[PDB]
Ligand binder design. Structure first.
Ligand code: SF4
Ligand code: SF4
Ligand code: SF4
Ligand code: FCO
Ligand SMILES: [Fe+2]
Ligand code: NI
Ligand SMILES: [S]
Lengths: 481, 279
C-alpha cells in the first residue's frame, strides 16, 4: 500500500512548513515541502530610503537577523560606494560571528535534541509520539536534558555578545551602510571576551562531544538522507579589506567534482510555487515577486533556485565540505573511539556519511568549533577606539549585491536604487536553497530529495521524516520572506 | 500553584518575539517554562508535531475553556481567504491563521498580542504589502470576538515586557480571580493597549542625551557618542518604552547608545518612523 503522511506544522524548526511524504514498503518514496506563510519583503521594501533596508530585512527572521543585516549592508556598501573602515569590518564580524554560535546551539539543543532525547514530563516536552525511538541510556539522556538547560543560558550569553556592539538582539541596530555604529572600547571588549570564554567552554566540553556521542547511538542515521549530494557556498566573513580572503571560501560541489561559484548561474523557478507564471526562470538581478496564491499545481511560497540547473543544498555541511577544514580535536578522538573511524579533515568522513541526517548535525557542531577560532582571531585583531563607520550620501541611481553565509547557508541580497529610493530588492536565502519545491522540469528541492529513502517502519510513529528535515535547520521565514 | 496553560500561535511572524523571550534573565526562560506557565503549544520548541500537536492544543483548549492564555506572534493576513498564512493541517483540512484565531480567540481567558506585528500590524502591514496583514485587536473586533486583548509591542519586545505582563496578570488573578484580575490588567493599559508599567514613560524625556538635544549638540556620525542622535534619525521623542532604564540583553547596550531609536513599540512602526536615518 501507499501511505500519504502530511505533517503540518513541522515543529522545532523556524517558521511554517508542511511536509507531505508517500511511504511504500517502509521507506519514503516521494516528498513535497510547502512553505505556508508569505509576507513579501521584496515588495514592502520598494520605494523606501535604501538605508532603511538594513533594519527592515532583519524582520525576515528573528533567529538569523544578523545574516540579513550583513547581506543588506554589504549590498548597500557596494551600491553607495561606501568604504568600510578596517576596524568596522572586524566589528561586524564580532557581531555576526556571535550569532553563528547562538544559532547552532539553539538548533542542536532546543530544536533538534528532542529528536533523540526525552524531556521532563511537562509541556512542552510532552506529549509526543508513543514510539519516539529514543535510544539513549538513562545517564546519557539526562546529560542531554542537563545540557539543553545549560544551553538556554549559553545561547542567551551569545546574544549578550551580539548586543555589546550590535545594540540589541534580535534585530541589531549596530550594522549600517558604511560600517558599524559603535566603536569597541577596551572595557566592552573585556566583556565580550569574558562571555566568549563561557560559550567556548560549553561548545568544547559539552556540545561537540554530545553530538558525536548521540550520533554513536544512532549510527543508522549516517546511512540515510544523502539526497543529491551537491552543495553550495558563496563565501563569508571577509578576513582583510581587499575582499580576497574569507573564513569560508566560495565553491560548488556536485557529482563528486569541485567547481567555482558563479552567481550569474542562479535562476529562480516558480512552476510549483505560488507566484505568477511569467516570473519563472529569473536571475536575482532581474527578479520579480508577484504572488499567485490560487495558482493550480503550486504547493509552496518558496521559489525554486537552481544553480546552472542543479538542485543544491547549503549550510554547515555545504561549507565544511567545500572548505574541508581540519576536524576538531574532540571529533578526531570520538570518531576513533566511538565509530572506529580515522579522520583528519572533514571530508575524511566520506561523502556518504557527511551528506546524511546525522552528518549534518556533525557538520554544524564542527562548524561551531571552527567559528571559535575565527572569533578569537578577531578579538586579537580588533583595535579599541579606532573608527568603524563612514557616512556616505544616498545615491540617486545605483545597484549592489551582498553575499554572505547565514548560519543555515548561502545568502544574497540585491538592491537597485533609482531616484534615491529602492527600485528593486531581491533576496535569495539559505533555506530557499534547501526547502524549495520542484522546479519547472520537476526536479525536487534538496530536502525533498534527501527525504527519499528515509525509513518509516511505523506509519503511526513516522519520526524519521521530521528528523531528516530538522537536520537541515530549516527556516521558512527566510525561505519565503 | 498550577501554571496556566498557554498556546503560542505564530502568524506572519519572524520568530524574533519567541527568541527575545528566550533571552529573559530574571526569571530565566527555564524557570518561566517549568515554574510560571505551561507552554502547551509552541511550534518552535514543542516535542510533538503536525496534526497531533494541533489535536493536543484542541484537547487542552476544551479542558481549560475560558482559562488558557493565547499568545499571538505575527500579524494575521486576511487576503486570499487566509492563504498567506497556513499554520497547520488536521482532519484533512488546512488551518489558516484566520481560522485559528477564530477558533481559539473566543475561548481564551485573554489574548496577548506579542510584538508590533501582532499588536499593530507592523512590517507585514507596511506600505508595499499585499496580504491584508491585520493586527490582533482589529481582527478580533472585526469578527465579533470580545476576548480581552493585551498588546506587548516592540520589534522585538524586551523579554521583561513579555514576562512582566504575564506576571502582572498572574498577580491580579491571584488577588481578584480570573475575570476580576484581567479587568485590573485592562485598567493599566494605555490607549494603545500597552501596559503602563513598561510603556508609560517616554524614551526622550528620560534620555541621558537630553541635555545635548536641548543645547543643539548633535552627532554627525554614528560613532560620536557625545552628541544627541536626533539628526541621525533618533525617534526617541515619539516613543513610549523603558529601554533607557532596563536596556537590552542583560543590560549590555540599548539602541540609543549604540545607534538610534527606530520607535519599534509604536503603532505606526515602521512607516511612521521611516526613514530611520533622517529626522
Ligand atoms: S514584532 Fe518584530 S520581532 Fe516580533 S514577529 Fe514581528 S517582525 Fe518579528
Ligand atoms: S538621543 Fe534620541 S531620545 Fe536621546 S535626547 Fe536625542 S533625540 Fe532624544
Ligand atoms: S530604544 Fe527604541 S528601537 Fe530600541 S527597543 Fe526601545 S523602543 Fe525599540
Ligand atoms: N540562517 C539563516 Fe536564515 C535561513 N535559512 C538566512 O539567510
Ligand atoms: Fe526572494
Ligand atoms: Ni532565518
Ligand atoms: S545570523
Amino acid at each position: 500500500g501507499r501511505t500519504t503522511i502530511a505533517i503540518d506544522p513541522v515543529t522545532r524548526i523556524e517558521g511554517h512548513l508542511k511536509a507531505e511524504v508517500v511511504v511504500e514498503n517502509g521507506k519514503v518514496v516521494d516528498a513535497r515541502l510547502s512553505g505556508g506563510m508569505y509576507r513579501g519583503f521584496e515588495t514592502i521594501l520598494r520605494g523606501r530610503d535604501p538605508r532603511d533596508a538594513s533594519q527592515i530585512v532583519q524582520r525576515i527572521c528573528g533567529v538569523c537577523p544578523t545574516a540579513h543585516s550583513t547581506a543588506s549592508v554589504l549590498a548597500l556598501d557596494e551600491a553607495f560606494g561606501a568604504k568600510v573602515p578596517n576596524n568596522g569590518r572586524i566589528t561586524r564580524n564580532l557581531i555576526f560571528g556571535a550569532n553563528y554560535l547562538q544559532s547552532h546551539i539553539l538548533h542542536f539543543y532546543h530544536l533538534s535534541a528532542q529528536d533523540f532525547v526525552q524531556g521532563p514530563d511537562t509541556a512542552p516536552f510532552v506529549p509526543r509520539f508513543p514510539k519516539s525511538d529514543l535510544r539513549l541510556s538513562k545517564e546519557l539522556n539526562k546529560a542531554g536534558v542537563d545540557q539543553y538547560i545549560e544551553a538556554l543560558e549559553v545561547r542567551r550569553i551569545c546574544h549578550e555578545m551580539v548586543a555589546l556592539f550590535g545594540g540589541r538582539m534580535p534585530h541589531v541596530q549596530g550594522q549600517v551602510v558604511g560600517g558599524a555604529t559603535e566603536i569597541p572600547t577596551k572595557e566592552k571588549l573585556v566583556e565580550y571576551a569574558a562571555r566568549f570564554k563561557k560559550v567556548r567552554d560549553f561548545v568544547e566540553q559539552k556540545y561537540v562531544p554530545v553530538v558525536y556521542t548521540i550520533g554513536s547511538k544512532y549510527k543508522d542515521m549516517f546511512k540515510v538522507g544523502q539526497g543529491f549530494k551537491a552543495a553550495l557556498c558563496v563565501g563569508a566573513f571577509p578576513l582583510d579589506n581587499s575582499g580576497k580572503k574569507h573564513l569560508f571560501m566560495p565553491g560548488v560541489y556536485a557529482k563528486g567534482k569541485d567547481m567555482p561559484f558563479d552567481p550569474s548561474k542562479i535562476k529562480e523557478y516558480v512552476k510549483y510555487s505560488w507566484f505568477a507564471e511569467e516570473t519563472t526562470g529569473l536571475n536575482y538581478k532581474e527578479g520579480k515577486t508577484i504572488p499567485a496564491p490560487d495558482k493550480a499545481g503550486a504547493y509552496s511560497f518558496v521559489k525554486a533556485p537552481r544553480y546552472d540547473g542543479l538542485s543544491l543544498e547549503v549550510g554547515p555541511l555545504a561549507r565544511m565540505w567545500v572548505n574541508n577544514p581540519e576536524l576538531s580535536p574532540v571529533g578526531k578522538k570520538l570518531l576513533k573511539d566511538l565509530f572506529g573511524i580515522s579522520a583528519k579533515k572533514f571530508r575524511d568522513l566520506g561523502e556518504e556519511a557527511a551528506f546524511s541526517l546525522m552528518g549534518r548535525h556533525v557538520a554544524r557542531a564542527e562548524e561551531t568549533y571552527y567559528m571559535l577560532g575565527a572569533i578569537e582571531g578577531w578579538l586579537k585583531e580588533i583595535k579599541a577606539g579606532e573608527d568603524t563607520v563612514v557616512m556616505p550620501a544616498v545615491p540617486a541611481s545605483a545597484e549592489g549585491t551582498g553575499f554572505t553565509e547565514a548560519p543555515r547557508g548561502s545568502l544574497l541580497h540585491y538592491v537597485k536604487v533609482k531616484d534615491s529610493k529602492i527600485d528593486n530588492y531581491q533576496i535569495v536565502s539559505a533555506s530557499l536553497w534547501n526547502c524549495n519545491p520542484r522546479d519547472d522540469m520537476g526536479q525536487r528541492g534538496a530536502v525533498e530529495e534527501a527525504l527519499i529513502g528515509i525509513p518509516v517502519d511505523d506509519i503511526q510513529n513516522p519520526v524519521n521524516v521530521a528528523r531528516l528535515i530538522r537536520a537541515f535547520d530549516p527556516x521558512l521565514g527566510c525561505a519565503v520572506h | 500553584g498550577e501554571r496556566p496553560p498557554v498556546f503560542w500561535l505564530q502568524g506572519q511572524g519572524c520568530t524574533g518575539c519567541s527568541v527575545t523571550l528566550l533571552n529573559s534573565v530574571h526569571p530565566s526562560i527555564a524557570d518561566v517554562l517549568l515554574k510560571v506557565i505551561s507552554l502547551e503549544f509552541h511550534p518552535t520548541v514543542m516535542a510533538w508535531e503536525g496534526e497531533h500537536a494541533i489535536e493536543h492544543m484542541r484537547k487542552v483548549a476544551e479542558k481549560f475553556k475560558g482559562k488558557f492564555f493565547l499568545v499571538i506572534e505575527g500579524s494575521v493576513p486576511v487576503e486570499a481567504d487566509g492563504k498567506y498564512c497556513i499554520i497547520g493541517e488536521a482532519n484533512h483540512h488546512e488551518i489558516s491563521m484566520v481560522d485559528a484565531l477564530k477558533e481559539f480567540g473566543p475561548n481564551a481567558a485573554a489574548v496577548l498580542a506579542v510584538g508590533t506585528c501582532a499588536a499593530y500590524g507592523g512590517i507585514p502591514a507596511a506600505e508595499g504589502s499585499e496580504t491584508g496583514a491585520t493586527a490582533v485587536s482589529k481582527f478580533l473586533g472585526d469578527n465579533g470576538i470580545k476576548t480581552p486583548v493585551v498588546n506587548i509591542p516592540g520589534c522585538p519586545p524586551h523579554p521583561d515586557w513579555i514576562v512582566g505582563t504575564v506576571v502582572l496578570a498572574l498577580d491580579a488573578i491571584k488577588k481578584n480571580g480570573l475575570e476580576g484580575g484581567l479587568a485590573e490588567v485592562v485598567k493599566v493599559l494605555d490607549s494603545d493597549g500597552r501596559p503602563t508599567p513598561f510603556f508609560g514613560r517616554n524614551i526622550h524625556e528620560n534620555c541621558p542625551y537630553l541635555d545635548k538635544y536641548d543645547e543643539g549638540v548633535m552627532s554627525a556620525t554614528f560613532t560620536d557618542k557625545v552628541g544627541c542622535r536626533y539628526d541621525l534619525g533618533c525617534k526617541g521623542p515619539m516613543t513610549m518604552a523603558d529601554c533607557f532604564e532596563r536596556k537590552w540583553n542583560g543590560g549590555v547596550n540599548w539602541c540609543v547608545q549604540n545607534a538610534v531609536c527606530i520607535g519599534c513599540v509604536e503603532p505606526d512602526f515602521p512607516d511612521g518612523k521611516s526613514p530611520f536615518y533622517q529626522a
